[PDB]
Structure formats: C-alpha cells, structure tokens
Design a protein around this ligand. Structure first.
Ligand code: LMT
Lengths: 1042, 161, 107, 268, 54, 54, 54
C-alpha cells in the first residue's frame, strides 16, 4: 500500500500492463442486447393432422402427461392441444438448471409413450425443444417482378437456403412462414366414384407402387470359389416428377384402357401445407422466423449470417432478392455506440470540470490518466468473470466514472491542499494524504461493495441486471482503490508539480484564477455558516425530520415497475377474427393494415410483413400477424414519429372503426417480461369435469372479475373462444349390412377432408413428402358429406349420407392442461397502481366460489412472483446494516456509522424529487441509481467525518473546532467529485436515442439524488457528527495530546 | 423385468440415465410390439421407498380399486413432477375397462376372443377427420369449422352395445 | 498422450439393399440439417456406404465435455429424427461417442 | 490416417458428381511427377462401379396374378436376405437369417431360376418383366461439411519434413480451376493452428515480458538490454535444427522458448 | 421432498369426499424433527454446562 | 485399461476350449510403458549429470 | 450389513439353468457345513415352481 509509492515505474508497469491487457481484453468480447436473463423452458410437440381437440388431447397429450414421470428440477407444466392437432406441452424449469440435461431426461421420458402414440404421429414428427419465445431475426425472401409465388420461394428456401445461410453459429429454432414442396395429389370424387374406386385404393396404390426396395448383389457374400464378379443389383426405385405420379397404375379396365392416377385425381407439385399465407407488402414472399437460442451471441450471428447470405447470393434464381425485416441487431450496435458516446462525453466533461478547478494541465492529466486504466482494467476483470459487454455493464461504467474519479480526485485534492498546508515535497505530501485516508479508502471500498453485494444475491431478472452492475462497478471500485494505493500516489509523487505552504492561488491569475478568490471567500462564508448552525443545532433536527418524512411520503406514492418500454425501431400488430371465421377475411384485414402503415405512415414505416394464420394465442384462420419495420432513427424526429404514439394512433384507427378486434403494439424490453402489476390465471379441472363445465366455470369467474369497480371490468382471456364443431356420427348398424368396411369408411372420410401422409419421393435430389387429399371444391360446405362413396366388398358404391348423421356443436380449439389435468387460461391484471398480491387475494376470493373439480393456479411469471417477494427491503436493510457494521470496523465505533448513515435520507429524497419532476418509476434502474446515490453520499460524509475524527483524536483538537476545520479542508473535494459526477451523468438524463429511456431512468435518479445529497449534507453532516458524538463518555469532551 | 445398473460412486445420475436410455431406444423395435406399448421405464432411483401415504374409508362403502382409482386419477400423476422422486408404487391399481369373457357363451355364438379383440378395436377409437372449409379453401368461402368423428367410449353401457 | 484429439459422435443406421445416393440424401445430409447452431464444432464429415449403412460423424472442439457435447448434438439430431426414414429405425440406429483409432486389438 | 496430412478437397458451388472428381484427377496427376518432394500420394474414395439395374414391369406382373409385395420380397430374400425373428442358441438369443445359397446368387443368369407363385398357383418367371442393364455408380458417397467431397492422402520421402510436402501439394495446384479449392483436416489441421500462431504468442508474450522486466527495475533501457540476448539463443537452435535435419514443430518451439528462458535468466 | 410432496397432496385435500381419511404408516419425517430438536438440546446443554465449569 | 481388460480376459480364461489361444497384434499399450521408462530414465540422468558437474 | 455378502455365481460357457441351479445346491448345502467360517448362507428368491406346459 505504501511500498508502491516509491517505485513509480513499477506502478506504471502495472498501469500500462493492465491497460493494454485491458484493451486486448476489450477486442474479442461478446456483445448482446441484454445478458442471458430469462428462465429456460422445454416443449414437446406431436403432429396428428386432421384430428380434433378431444382426439389429440386424449390420444397424444394425456399419454404424454402420463409418461412424463421422472424429471428432475421440474417447476411446472402447461400443455396445449390445438384443433389443428398439434400438441404443445411446455415444462418450464428452475432458473440456472442445465437446460440441455433437463431437455434430455424429458426427451427420454417422451419415448415411453411412442408406440402408444398414433402411427401418423410416429412418422410425422415428435419434437423436444429447448425454447425461448422471441425471434432474433426474420429473413424474408421475395421476388420483385413477382415471377414466383409464396410456395415457390418457400421451396427454394427449404431446399438450398434454410441450411447454407445457417452455416453461421447462433441460431436456435426456425418457424417457416410457408411450407416445403410436397407431391400434392387432389382426388376427384366424381372421377373416382366413376371407376368404383376409393381413396384407400389410391393409398395402397402409391404405397406399394412407389418405393425403393431391398435388392441384393451379384456375387453375394459368401460367394463360391472361382467367382470373379461382385456387383450390386438395383431394384425398384422411388419417383421424381408430377409426371411419374399420374402414370401409376390403379387398375386395368377389361378392354385394355388403363386406369392411371392421372385420371382419377389432379396432380401438382405443391407445398406440404397451405395454412399460413406469408405476404410481404402485396408482393408474394416466404419467410424464416429465427428464434434466438437460450444463451446465444447477437452481433456475430447477424454479421456472419448476412455475410454467409450475401455469399450465398451467386445461387440466386429469377428476381429472387433478399430482405431483412425483423432485425433486433442494428439496434444493439447503435445502442452500444450511443452508450460508448455517453462514456466519452462523461469523461471529457469530467476532464473539463477537473481543469476548471485545478487550472493546470499536468494536474488535470493525473486523474485523467487514472480513468482509462480503471475502465479498461475492469473490462479485464469482466473478461475474466465470463460475462458480456451489454447495455447494463457499460451503464455500470458510466456510473463508475463518478466513483473512480471520486477516489482519485479525493487523493489528488488532499495532496494539493496538504502542499498548501505544510510545504513538503510531493512524496511527503502524498504519504500524508495516503496516511490520512488509507483506512478511509479501504473502508469506503468495503461499504460501497457492501451496498452492491446484497443486490447481487437476489434472484430474478432484476438480480441479473444487479449482477452485471454490481460486478462492473465493484470491480471498477476495487480497481480504483488499489489504484489509490498503487497508481494515484505514484502519480502524485512524480508528474505533479510541487507547491509550497499556503498558496491557494487566490487572485493570482487573470483569466482562470479569479474563480479561486470567489471560491475561497465563499468557503469561509460557508464555514461561518457551519459554525453558525453548530451554534444552534435544534431547529435543523426538526428540519431533518421534515426532510425524512418528505422522503417517505414521496417514496410511497411513486409508481413501481420492472423495466422501461423500448422503441427498438421495430414493432408489430396482432389480428383476430371472431369464432369460426375464414382465411379470406383475415387476409383482408392484413392487407388493410399493410395499406394503412404504408399509406398514412409513409415517412415512418419502411416495411410490413403480413403473416396470416399465425398468432400467439393460437394457430388458425381466425388469427393474423403483421410485422412492422421503420427506417433508421436519423429520419425520425418528433413525438408522433415514435413507436408509442404510432401504436397509439394505430390502435385508435383499428378499434372504434372495425368489425373485429385488432391491436398494434411494441415488444417488451427483454423477450419475456414479468406480466406487470397483474397475472396469468390458470383455472384447473381436478375432479374430471366437462369442457363446457370448465367453460362455464370460466364464465362465472370472469363475470365476477367484472363485478367490482375496485379492480376491473370486462377483463379478457388470451386464447380462442369455442369454435363450431361438426359431428358426423357413423351409424355402425346401417353400414355393416351393405358390406362396407369401417376402416375404409373412416380412412376415406379422412383422406377426403383431412389429408394423408403416405410416402416420400426425391425432388431434385432432396427427399420430400407425398400427400393425397381431396380437391378444392369437393370438401367445403356440409352438404358435400354425400359426394363421397365407399366401394363395398364386391363393387357397389355406398354414399356417406347413408350413415353420416350430421350436426353442429361447440368446442374450444385451444385445449390447455396444467400438471396432468384439463385447465383454461385467463390473462389479467389490477387497477393502475394496485399491488398484485392484493389482486391475488380478490381473484382467489372470487375463485373461492368454485365446485370441487374447479380450482385456481398461477403460472409463468406470476408463478415465481407468487411465493417470493416481500424480502427485498429486508435485503437492502441488510445492505445498510452491513454498511453500518463495516464502517464501525474501519472506524472503531458503534456510534459514528449512525452519524454518517443519518445522511442517507438526504440522498434518497433527491432521487425521488427527480423521479416525480420528469415522471419516471421505481424500476430496476432507479433502484440501482438509489443505491449508488446512497453509496457516494455516504462516501463524502464518511471522509468529512473521518477528518473530524482524526483531528479530534490525533492532534487533540476539540469537537466543534475540528468539525469546523474538517468542513473547511474537505469541502473543495466534495464539490470536485460531486460537480464532476453530476456533469458526468447529465449526458444520460437528457438524451433521445436507442434505449434512451434506460439512460434517463438511471440518469434522473442519480443526478437528483446527488444534488440533494451534496447541497444538503454539506450543511447537515457536521450537525450529525456533533449531536451523535455527544453520547460517549463525559471526559474527555475536547482532548489534548501532542 | 427389472434391470438395475450400478455405477461408479458420485457419477452424475442424469447423463448416465439418459445415455443408458439412448442405448435403450436402440433395442426398442427389437422388443415385442406388445411390450413397447406396455411400458418401458428408465429411472434414477434409490432402492428403498422414502415415504408411504395410505388412504382409507372407515365406513366400508368402497374397495381397493376405487380408492386406487381416485388416487391414480388425481394424485399418482403429480407425484413425479415434485422433483426428487424416482418411482411411485400404488398400493392398489388404476381403473380399467375390465371385460371378462364367458367361454360357453363365446362358443355358443360362433365367435373367438380374437373377433372380440378386432371388434372393440375397430369399434372404439378416434379417427382423423377434417374441417368444413378445409385448408386450403377456395375463393368466396366464408365458413370454417371442425369435423368431429367417432368418439371413444365412457360407460359400461357403451361397451355392452 | 493426453486426451488431445477432438471429440466426435457418430450415428450408424442399417438401410439394407439401398445404393449410395439413396441413403446419403435420405439419411446423411438430412441428419446435419437441423444442426445449424452446433457448439464447439471443428469440422464435420458424414459418409453413406453402398451396403446401405450410414456413417454420420459430428466432430467437436477438444476438451468439450463429451457427454455434454453428445447431449447438445444428439439433441440437435433428434430434432431431425423423423427426417430419417422410419423404415430404418427397426434394426438399430446407434449414436456413439467414437474416435477413429483402435486402442488395442486382441485376437 | 496418414502421417503428415489429410489434403481436403471441398465442394463449394455444388459442381457435379465426377466433374469435381475430374478436377481431383487433374490435381493428383499434376502432382505425380515429383518424387523429389513427396511420396506415396493416394486418392480417398471408391471409384464408380458398374451398376446392374433390374426393372420390374407392374402391368406384365399384375396380369399373371403375382403380388408385387411377394415378387419384391422374394427378390430380396433370395439375393439380399431377411431378418425375421430370433432363436435361442445354447442359452444366448441369436438372429435368424434366410437367404439363397452359394450357387444360386453369383452371376446374373441366376435371375431366371426364381419363380413367383401367383394368386392362383402358377409360377411366373422373372423374364416376364425383368429388363436388365449396366450403369455407373460410386459405392462410397462421403461428405465434408454437409456436401459430397473427396480428399487426397499422402506422405513424404525419408527426412520427413511435413511443411514442404504440404506446401508442395499446394504448389502443383497452380494450374487448377479455382472454384475447386483446398482446405485442411486431421493432422495438418492441428499443424495449421501451429506456426501461424507464433505472431500472437510472441507479440503478447515478449511485450508483456518487456514491461514485466521493466517492473522490478526502473528504466526504459534495461528490458532492452535483456531482450537483446534472446536471438543469440535462437540462432543456435536453428543452426542445430538444420544441421541434424529436423523441423519447426511443437517440441522445437517449446525448446526454443525454454532456451529463451535460460538466456533471459542469465541476462537478468 | 416432503415439503413439495405433502404440499402436492395438500392441494388435493380440498377435493376429498365422504369419510375419505388419510393414514401414515411409513414415515421418516417427525423422527428427524425430534432428533435435531434433541441435538439442539445437546448444544444448549454443552453451552450451559461449560458455563457452569467456567 | 489393459489391466482391467486383462482381468476381463483372465476371468474368461478358465472357460477356454482346446488350443483356443489369444494373440496381441495391434498393441499401443506397452509402447507407453517403455516410452515413459526411457523418458523418466532421461530425467534421472539429467539429475545425476547435474550432480557430477556440481 | 457389516458381516455378509452377495455371491453372484455366473454361468459363462452356457451350460444351462439346472446346471447352475444344481451347482448352487451343491455350494449352498456344502457351505452350510461350515459354521466356523460363514453363517446363514441362503438363497433370497423363489425356488423353482412347477411349470405347466401346454
Ligand atoms: C460555491 C458557492 C458558495 C457555497 C457555500 C456558501 C455558503 C453561504 C452561507 C450563507 C447563509 C448563512 O448561514 C446561515 O446563517 C447563520 C450564519 O451565521 C446561521 O445562523 C446563525 O446566525 C447568527 C450567527 O451568530 C446567530 O448565532 C444564530 O443563532 C445562528 O443560528 C445559520 O442559520 C446558517 O444556516
């Protein structure tokens, strides 16, 4: 600690070494939007095409929830059963649990119910997926002259692009807007009734006709002696064209005229599915929704993907151009750019304050050079803890400037003043100051770290931000302190010009130095005030109590939050058509939206991506989605040109004047936020009740959740309402006479109105699927039931209308289950400033009116937020108590920490006063800002107090006189640190740009808190020290040794 | 069958279990097609049951299978999602549709157990249906709805008929 | 020597009778297709024999936990498992942590 | 597999099935007149063998009353084989194979001797539908980084310096159609990340060394005076390496470093 | 384990029919409670006795 | 590996029929032993030579 | 169990079930005439039941 101050080149060696180790450790370091924050979840999915809700829930879903018995670290399970047949059983796990292993046990708990599953599922994919919820990027492919259509682009994508542009690492899961080409065979019921044939006959046909077949080899092992030929018999070979599929033999008519598939059915090389239409600005397109993986890099994935794609350009067909719509990537780059800019601005402004106080360049350089080595060095500490340069860390350094410049400035200041107090050379002055603030600086390190550590030990996303922050600034802090012991004093003893006793530069300089005079005089004025208030202390205690009360009040009536909403240059709109609506109408809506955006928002909107058939609440014709990109912020001024007001007027235009509900908005900051001051209600069936039983329970509950003026009214579920289900009872009796086979009756019903996965062919080299289905018109309105005939055992055709009792009913298409039993979800919240737990109490008390078999539950965010909460203030209480004790450690008093901590309110009331003035919220950033503020305020108070104590104890000076003198000597430094800090964090507070809401959210609180902290404590700390000290032994009061 | 594999002490249970099971999902078609649907379980497991919770009815009004039913219907499906559990053994058993054939009455009507098998098989099942306005529909179409097909049974009645 | 060489896992499947181009473009490339985001990947090489038996090798960075590497990759292939013929899955398909050199041969 | 390297030819633009192969033939043929550089260079892959196609005609079979399932299954079970069930030999469960015999599945004419019992009871010959012919087909289809490609194995003449043989394999490639390229795998992949890592190691290490010496000492001159000694230890390692005839490998680089070590000690 | 299992069961408790009562035959739980309670007792005993000697 | 393999074989050794003998043609195992023997020997020699110089 | 063990007697060359079972009879009966070495040597498992071939 002291040994370093005489070996200066050793010090600079440590300096430059860790500064260049810094820079080196700054180059190849990961960069992302946020760190890997959100909890990991894994999902099982199985495809049973055609099958209904009650079918897939009770043939695939339940058998999965029955054979998912033995997973470790399991939190909760939530399973979907779409009317489309696709099951979605998502298990979300304990945070930090190894995702890969959880997914693996789960997947090997999935292959227990595999032969028990339908044979159409068994070959059409069962998937286990580690899964997030938000796409990193969506890469669209289009054709400008409109040469090809959606399905074509989808084909080229799935054939040459959806695996070559991805030879760039960092992608987790793609959802294709479109579908792969299949061999689409469309059956004519009239042309197939004609020849006395059934869909089944087509099945067996294309099955046994089209295949690759096990052959053998000439000279097969083991051959016999003398044999000198070995070669491989080629057998039957799979198909290739739409041509080769028509000319397959179904039957031969007696006269010789053949019956080919070409006859009974129309054949096109067509996609495997036509459920979702991906329309890009009218122009036909096909897209890739690339989900980001749990723990994947951001900017290198996108750089190498765009490089790979631009290098995959020499494989491009007619007019096939690439578009890059949904991109959350350049937002990150520009964000980091502006944060770095903030750093530079803060640094330079601090430099300017430093010069406009010390007025000589080579002294300004002393704390100046101190800054790169603490920052860069912290990066080296960051590069060693295995985290990443995101927003939070860089913001941590932005705040750290204050702390590091605090320690450095304090050192340099005390040195400069000591030279004005004794006259000794640089070295001796240095040792004096260091000897005065040694235990002090160690202590401040201890306490600052004692406010940052208990925020590192809390869980959740707030705790992740807290981790990034704490690590950043604490590391920076330890660095600044060890710099104070090693780097700052070595710098003081050397480059610093020497000053003899009592200069102070009063009136000595023409341009700059006049300030000193104005400054110096005021200091004495200031001191005359301090004594003045120590003269009569009482009134200031009352005023203190007042200030405290104001702090409490202002704190209570302050809006809580989690994170700020972010204009990311990219937002989206969601579309919903009512029960049992049609693809056509939703297409109308999407094109209408796409018109509005590229019409009345031309200067703002750059590209719309209308994806119909794909929502969030469910899959279906009812729902649609449209992505919206906006050009670079450089061309977007104003208030109405920003995401919020845009979605405001968008929802304005798309609610009051439309037939169905359609809402436009912006994605949250993370990728899956805590569900605000509200919740995600899981209503669960237990005693095995109906679907209309549960639906009716939801009706009663949601009706109760509309019967208060003190909570909400007409709240809503996020999920599809009951769709019309069309029951077709085959009467077994009326069928078993006519000699028709139920297997065939069913299979024909399916293959007509559902579809069939039968075989695989070889398109251009790539294996694709073979599909047989009805045709466009012969499977629409219900009367088409009849038009399909079953060929009986001999050769007589029976109509479906001979047994098909037809009717209407209701059934919800989105069938949810929670922990092995039927359940239904209800999104919801609480009145604007209601505590969520209170809403919990009201909803549970409204769910205390349910029939055995109907219960309540909490899921997702509001699950982890349910049994954990009211201990955070206890943890911060721990922060202040630990700070208390630690100060008592470096000091040695169960009383002086009282005197310094009493100053803490004076720092909070200013963050609050700043929060209300501009209008923010007690979120994460404001809480960190609060903490920091408490920290620095406590620092300044700590040092003033320290000098008062040291004078009192080691020079025999009395209380009052020494408080006055300590006040005198350590005022200027307080103002140096303070002013440099406020002027350093100012660039944050008032800025507009990528994520500037974050900047303002930290900035505001930090600044205001600091203002009140200094410009009240510098009048309050002495009274604290005085009245606190008057409770420890009578004799002595005013000591005297020599 | 009960195949117990013991490993070197301190070895990570999960990876060993899966890797073993991913050598088990190699000999799965090699297993009878009648076994493959009758349950294969790979379990990280102690050797002694930790705790046993029994349920009774003092009055008399029910037997093993009933209590066991409510158990296996509402309870013995969650105690394996309470992490730290390897395998629960129900002292009892879950409800099934138990059909017991009369052999003289099966000789009587010229039938075999096989015919009963095929019967209840092809009679009781869910079958791939479709939708009115099936995707992709044609222009002008303004109705989309879900075809219900044959629906599995429920009672002792629906099994008699 | 120490555990120097990169860790690789290999899939092998019996596809009887079929020729080279049949098994390569139905099994081989089709395995590596849902593998876009493999961690610690050095280089990748997969073969398709005329005996119908495929040899799909995924190689990783050295010192990467073999068990864990196998977990991420085998769980990047068992995304592309129905993509392989369901007609092969009857005579055993094996995923094995595997080198290329015999430790010892005892005759 | 081969000591030295595994010269890897990679497909990039998807340029053919034997076209790329012809480029490789051009490559190995261009590099075949140098025995004063390399030795025992060889191609890695089975070349295209003659393939024997036997098309069944569906019509001419569906007339005679034979079942396609049965005709195929019989062709297979005859000249291929069948795995049907398992038996229990001496206590251990083993597999059951049924196939043709040593004499009925050799030369192609044995195609005929197999008859399918039709739906009624008449045996139909293979010559009723089996059009037979010859083709070309490679039996080994291997791929590298997701596409078919084939490499070139090799070694070098006694006095085995690896870098000269690698560099030479690259040097006869100065008459090749770029769009057909080179890359590395196996040994000389690791020997690739060994060497061209010298500037990173020496730049970080030696400068860090400069400052590190500068630490306990107090002059921007003394680290100069010490680091100036390092070459004098190197020139002798080199002079020893060439005279006996070795190579700049790993062991020689570690040796170099150690030598630098002792020299730096003495100077220090 | 017993917390999550007994909680798991206790949520299935407000759905229990007529006279359907629970019994606990194989229980390794309260034995722990009394054991640790007595160990703490031992700790206290050591403290106070040591104090007495002191 | 070779020791436990030698165990694997030697426990299967009392079950060997007429003339059923084992051969070791491909062995990368004893080479390790003899290599390490010569390297360690070299180390020791360096030590002793240092002693002699001293 | 402190004193005690778990003897797994293994058939290797494949000689049968009554070969090994009779071997176990010989061993367990002969190792019952040593009280000065072992104790309570026993089979833990159901003995061969009569199986009814149809
Ligand atoms: C850089 C810009 C300058 C920064 C600091 C400038 C400080 C300017 C302080 C001027 C205000 C005077 O400060 C205020 O008035 C006098 C000071 O004597 C004090 O009040 C005192 O007045 C007289 C002094 O004998 C009486 O003793 C009285 O009982 C006592 O309360 C305090 O009430 C003090 O709060």
């Amino acid at each position: 600690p002291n040994f370093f101050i005489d070996r200066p080149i050793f010090a600079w060696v440590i300096a430059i070494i860790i500064m260049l180790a810094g820079g080196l450790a700054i180059l190849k370091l990961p960069v992302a939007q946020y760190p890997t924050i959100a909890p990991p979840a894994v999902t099982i999915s199985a495809s049973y095409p055609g099958a209904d809700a009650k079918t897939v829930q009770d043939t695939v879903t339940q058998v999965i929830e029955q054979n998912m018995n033995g997973i470790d670290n399991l939190m909760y399970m939530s399973s979907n059963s779409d009317s489309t047949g696709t099951v979605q059983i998502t298990l979300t796990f304990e945070s930090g649990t190894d995702a890969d292993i959880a997914q693996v046990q789960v997947q090997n708990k999935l292959q227990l119910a595999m032969p028990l599953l339908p044979q159409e599922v068994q070959q059409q994919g069962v998937s286990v997926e580690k899964s997030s919820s938000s796409f990193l990027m969506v890469v669209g492919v289009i054709n400008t002259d409109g040469t090809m259509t959606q399905e074509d682009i989808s084909d080229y994508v799935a054939a040459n692009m959806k695996d070559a542009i991805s030879r760039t690492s960092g992608v987790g899961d793609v959802q294709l807007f479109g579908s792969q080409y299949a061999m689409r065979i469309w059956m004519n019921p009239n042309e197939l009734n004609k020849f006395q044939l059934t869909p089944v006959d087509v099945i067996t046909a294309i099955k046994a006709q089209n295949a690759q077949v096990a052959a053998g080899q000439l000279g097969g092992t083991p051959p016999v002696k003398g044999q000198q030929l070995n070669a491989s018999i080629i057998a039957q070979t799979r198909l290739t064209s739409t041509e080769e599929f028509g000319k397959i033999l179904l039957k031969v008519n007696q006269d010789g005229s053949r019956v080919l598939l070409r006859d009974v059915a129309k054949i096109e090389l067509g996609g495997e599915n036509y459920d979702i239409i991906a329309e890009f600005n009218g122009q036909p397109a096909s897209g890739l929704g690339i989900k980001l993986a749990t723990g994947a890099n951001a900017l290198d994935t996108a750089a190498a993907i765009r490089a790979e794609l631009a290098k995959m350009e020499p494989f491009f067909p007619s007019g096939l151009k690439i578009v890059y719509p949904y991109d959350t990537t350049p937002f990150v780059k520009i964000s980091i750019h502006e944060v770095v800019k903030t750093l530079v601005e803060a640094i330079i402004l601090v430099f300017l304050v430093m010069y406009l106080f010390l007025q000589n360049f080579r002294a300004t350089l002393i704390p100046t050079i101190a800054v790169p080595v603490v920052l860069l060095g912290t990066f080296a500490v960051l590069a060693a803890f295995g985290f990443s340069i995101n927003t939070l860390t860089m913001f941590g350094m932005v705040l750290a400037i204050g702390l590091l410049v605090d320690d450095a400035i304090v050192v340099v200041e005390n040195v400069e003043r000591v030279m004005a107090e004794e006259g000794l050379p640089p070295k001796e002055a240095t040792r004096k100051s260091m000897g005065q603030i040694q235990g002090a600086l160690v202590g401040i390190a201890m306490v600052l770290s004692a406010v940052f550590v208990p925020m590192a030990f809390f869980g959740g996303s707030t705790g992740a931000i807290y981790r990034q922050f704490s690590i950043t600034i604490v590391s920076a802090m330890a660095l600044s302190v060890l710099v104070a012991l090693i780097l700052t004093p070595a710098l003081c003893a050397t480059m610093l010009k020497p000053i003899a006793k009592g200069d102070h530069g009063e009136g000595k300089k023409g341009f700059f130095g006049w300030f000193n005079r104005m400054f110096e005089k005021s200091t004495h004025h200031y001191t005359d005030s301090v004594g003045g208030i120590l003269r009569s202390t009482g009134r200031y205690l009352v005023l203190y109590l007042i200030i405290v009360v104001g702090m409490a009040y202002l704190f209570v009536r302050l809006p809580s939050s989690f994170l700020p909403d972010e204009d990311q240059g990219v937002f989206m709109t969601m579309v919903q058509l009512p029960a049992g609506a049609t693809q056509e109408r939703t297409q109308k809506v999407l094109n209408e939206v796409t018109h509005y955006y590229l019409t009345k928002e031309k200067n703002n909107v750059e590209s719309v991506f209308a994806v119909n058939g794909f929502g969030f609440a469910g899959k279906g014709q009812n729902t649609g989605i449209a992505f919206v990109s906006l050009k670079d912020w450089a061309d977007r001024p104003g208030e109405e040109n920003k995401v919020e007001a845009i979605t405001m007027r968008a929802t304005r235009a798309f609610s009051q004047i439309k037939d169905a509900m359609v809402f436009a908005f912006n994605l949250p900051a993370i990728v899956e936020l805590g569900t605000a001051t509200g919740f995600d209600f899981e209503l669960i069936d237990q005693a095995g009740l109906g679907h209309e039983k549960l639906t009716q329970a939801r009706n009663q509950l949601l009706a109760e959740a509309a019967k208060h003026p003190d909570m909400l009214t007409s709240v809503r579920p996020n999920g599809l309402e009951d769709t019309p289900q069309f029951k077709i009872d085959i009467d077994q009796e009326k069928a078993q006479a006519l000699g028709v086979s139920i297997n065939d009756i069913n299979t024909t019903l399916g293959a007509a109105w559902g579809g069939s996965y039968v075989n695989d062919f070889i398109d251009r080299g790539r294996v694709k699927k073979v599909y047989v289905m009805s045709e466009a018109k012969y499977r629409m309105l219900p009367d088409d039931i009849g038009d399909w005939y079953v060929r009986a055992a001999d050769g007589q055709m029976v109509p479906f209308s001979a047994f098909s009792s037809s009717r209407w009913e209701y059934g919800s298409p989105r069938l949810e289950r929670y922990n092995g039993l039927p359940s239904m979800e209800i999104l919801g919240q609480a009145a604007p400033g209601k505590s969520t737990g209170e809403a919990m109490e009201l909803m549970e008390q409204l769910a205390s009116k349910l029939p055995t078999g109907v219960g309540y539950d909490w899921t997702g965010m509001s699950y982890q937020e349910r049994l954990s909460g009211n201990q955070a203030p206890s943890l911060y209480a721990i922060s202040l108590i630990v700070v208390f004790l630690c100060l008592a450690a470096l000091y040695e008093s169960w009383s002086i920490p009282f005197s310094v901590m009493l100053v803490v309110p004076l720092g909070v009331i200013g963050a609050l006063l700043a929060a209300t003035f501009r209008g923010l919220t007690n979120d994460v950033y404001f809480q960190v800002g609060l903490l920091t503020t408490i920290g620095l305020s406590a620092k300044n108070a700590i040092l003033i107090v320290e000098f008062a104590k040291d004078l009192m104890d080691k020079e025999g000076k009395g209380l009052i006189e020494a408080t006055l003198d300590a006040v005198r000597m350590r005022l200027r430094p307080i103002l140096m640190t303070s002013l440099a800090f406020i002027l350093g964090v100012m660039p944050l507070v008032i800025s507009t740009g990528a994520g500037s809401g974050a900047q303002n959210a930290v900035g505001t609180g930090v600044m205001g808190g600091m203002v009140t902290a200094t410009v009240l404590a510098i009048f309050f700390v002495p009274v604290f020290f005085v009245v606190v000290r008057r409770r420890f032994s009578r004799k002595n009061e005013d000591i005297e040794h020599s």
